[PDB]
Amino acid sequence: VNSFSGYLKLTDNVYIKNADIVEEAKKVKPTVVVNAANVYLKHGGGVAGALNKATNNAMQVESDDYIATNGPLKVGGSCVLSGHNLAKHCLHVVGPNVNKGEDIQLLKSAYENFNQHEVLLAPLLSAGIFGADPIHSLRVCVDTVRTNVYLAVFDKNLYDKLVSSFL
Numbered sequence: 001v002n003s004f005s006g007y008l009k010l011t012d013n014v015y016i017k018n019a020d021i022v023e024e025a026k027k028v029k030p031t032v033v034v035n036a037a038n039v040y041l042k043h044g045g046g047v048a049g050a051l052n053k054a055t056n057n058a059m060q061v062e063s064d065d066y067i068a069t070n071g072p073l074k075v076g077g078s079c080v081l082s083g084h085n086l087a088k089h090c091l092h093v094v095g096p097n098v099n100k101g102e103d104i105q106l107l108k109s110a111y112e113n114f115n116q117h118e119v120l121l122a123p124l125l126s127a128g129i130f131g132a133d134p135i136h137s138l139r140v141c142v143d144t145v146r147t148n149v150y151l152a153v154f155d156k157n158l159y160d161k162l163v164s165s166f167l
């Protein structure tokens, strides 16, 4: 039993809710919240900008130190950093950005990072300002993630479309 509330069950292990991931993290305080990161951990907009803003920029400060030490992530890769006031940990995962021409096949590699964590609160990777089709992202999620994932979809219109079109 866990504290996630109001989710629709899509499969054995994937759940979905129309929710602001920032507000959901603040309420549940999950072990892991996933950030829709880029390779530079520059949290300017989208989910990343919103999560970082909610940490009062502490996520960005920590991220800048991480990059200065380790260099950029790979597209499809991830790193575990603090969850600050939102979660125990933040898993920063880099989905391909279609608006940069990155290979959509890397979306499966990106979701594989979730399998290293038993339970996660997450957005749909590569959706929103990353330019991919969110229906496709949900399909890859369901077909790749085997651990328990609670997906937060900000847009109510998109949430209803994802549910109604789910196979």
Ligand SMILES: O=c1[nH]nc([C@H]2CCCN(c3ncnc4[nH]ccc34)C2)o1
Binding pocket: 019, 020, 021, 022, 046, 047, 050, 123, 124, 127, 128, 129, 152, 153, 154, 155
């Ligand atoms: O307006 C739109 N069009 N496409 C989106 C998705 C992609 C980027 C943001 N993403 C989120 N998912 C869950 N929580 C969130 N908080 C803030 C953002 C957010 C949804 O948003």
